[PDB]
Structure formats: C-alpha cells, structure tokens
Symmetry: C2
Subunit: 185 residues, 2 copies
C-alpha cells in the first residue's frame, strides 16, 4: 500500500484520470489518495503547489504551473473575454491581476478555495477560470470545458513532489515518483 497526499484538484482533475496507467505498470501497488494543501506522517509521498524555489527540503519539481483560460463549452470562439465574469480563486488572488498584465472586469459573486471548484463553476456557466494545463487536459478532452483563445499564464508556481526523509529509499515511492515524472515533465 502506497499512501499519497496531493492537492484536492490535483486529485480529481489529474490523478484519478491518470492513475490507471500507474496500475498498468505496477499492478501490485494499491494506492490510497489523500488530499491536502498545507505544510508537509500518514503519507508516503506528497504533491504540493509552491512558489518556484530550490530551497525545499526533500523535494523535486514535477512541473512549473502554466494556467489556461477555461470557459463553458457553450462559449463561442480578443477582449470579448471581458464580457464574461472572472471566477475568483481566493487562495490565489494575484492570478487575475497577473492575467490583466499578461494581456489587456466583472468578478463572479462566488469565490472558491480550489481549482476543482472553479472548474465546476465553469461547467455551471458562471464565467471564466484559470486552470493548470495538466489539470484542464482531461476535462477538455472529454468535453466538460474548453480552452478560451489559446490564452495562458505562467504563474511563478510549481508542483513539487515532497518525500518524507525515511521514504527516500522506499521502492513503491520511487516507482510512483518516476511515474509522475514520466507523465508530467
């Protein structure tokens, strides 16, 4: 048994869609998926979203965070973008301010802590959201949401694998980590 602890949205928007491929590779390893977004005993490996840095401590960068502009599949295909409400993500308020800077507003009246909630709000046609590319990928593929106007944002964040010191030589952990690296480099 491998216990992994990953962000609430990393879990539903990427890991659950992709984990079948890990099980194809290593059928003998059952996985318990926990969720969390705070500071990093129960889990064997964590995935967290942190400002890009070299000074974190048993960690390895999986991938830099690149956000896509997403909207409902009903939206038609420059700054007609401004006609739609922007969905606030309350943990990441700089994102829309940065977007206003990558380019160029009414904010939707509900703000959300997590990407997966913002994604659900886009499915509810409440406005546009910024979602990490790898998280949007399956949802776009299956027709839940669409990428609006090929617009993106480099946020200055990354997804890191963080491993408890005693797990640094655990085989199950190194196998999952290598798998993550393979899919998300």
């Amino acid at each position: 048994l491998l216990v992994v602890d990953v962000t609430p949205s990393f879990a539903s928007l990427w890991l659950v869609p992709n984990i079948n491929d890990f099980h194809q590779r290593h059928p003998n390893i059952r996985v318990k998926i926990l969720t969390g977004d705070g500071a990093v005993g129960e889990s064997d490996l964590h995935v967290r979203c942190l400002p890009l840095s070299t000074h974190y401590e048993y960690s390895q960068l999986l991938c830099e965070e690149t956000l896509l502009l997403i909207g409902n599949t009903n939206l038609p295909k420059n700054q007609a973008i401004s006609h739609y409400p922007f969905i606030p993500q309350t943990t990441r308020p700089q994102l829309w301010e940065q977007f206003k800077q990558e380019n160029d507003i009414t904010y939707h009246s509900v703000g959300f802590e997590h990407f997966y909630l913002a994604c659900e709000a886009v499915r509810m046609e409440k406005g546009l959201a910024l979602l990490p590319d790898f998280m949007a990928q399956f949802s776009i593929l299956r027709g839940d949401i669409q990428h609006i106007g090929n617009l993106k944002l480099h946020s200055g964040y990354g997804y890191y694998v963080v491993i408890p010191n005693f797990r640094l030589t655990s085989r199950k952990v190194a196998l999952f980590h290598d798998w993550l690296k393979d899919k998300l480099t």
Copy 2:
C-alpha cells in the same frame, strides 16, 4: 456583504456550486466564499457530515444521508468493482445487507469516488442530493434504484459570533428550503 461558508469538499462541488445561483437569485448582494473542510468545527457557517445523533449541542440537522448506487452513464451489478471510501469502511457490506472485489485506489471524499465512476473504475455510493445534477447532465447514472440509508446526516453549525447575523440566517434558511 461577504458570507464565508465552510462545507465538505464534495458538498461544495457536487451540490453547492450547482445550486448556489438560487441563493443569489434570492439575495443578489451577498457575495460568497466557499471553503472546504471535514474536521472538527475563519467561516460564518459550517456544513459537516456526522453520524445521526440527538446529543450534539448546537448542531442543526439539515438532512439525513441517503446514498445512491452510482455507475457511469454507459452502464447497461456483480460484474463491476466497488470503489472504496476509506473513511466509511462499512458502507459496501451494509449496502450488501439489503439485497466483494474492491477497486485498488482511494478515497476519503465522495467527489473523488464520483470522478472514479466517470473514469469507468466501478460503482460508487453517493448522497442523493450530490448525485442529482451530475445525473441530470449525464455524467453518471443511478443503478437499479438501489439506495442505502447510511446512518449519517448533514449538520449546520453556526459559530457563537454569528448567532444574530442576517446573512448567515438567510443562507441557512435557504439550505433548509433546498435540502430539508
């Protein structure tokens, strides 16, 4: 005004996000921030899922939990794996007492079980009100009209500093209107 609510991860995505526009229809001036949590009860109002009890001090029962048997929209039940939810290790046995082979992954949260169903990983048990819109929009389906009264309930907790707060009372009244 801003109202901050703290509800379970799945209550948020599977019910509150699809429904909250009805609240704004009633009260368009009240902005909302939706936080998620599932531990012991910052926020103006909490929704938690607890075993049914009449001994809670200041928790108000919103609705009892009725779980539906859920599968993917392309299901035409023994042939399918059951998706385990680790915080509720008894549920499948207990479902099976009304009338084996679990999936090799996860989860503590309903919203993860729901995604697993979408990923064709097996069958899940999901609260009826949480399944409702996902069923409507064709993400999932209810299998065989099968259900389970789980013994849990959804409780609203109003913190002691919000006891006279209009925005909190309005939101609570709305929840009761929709779910009780």
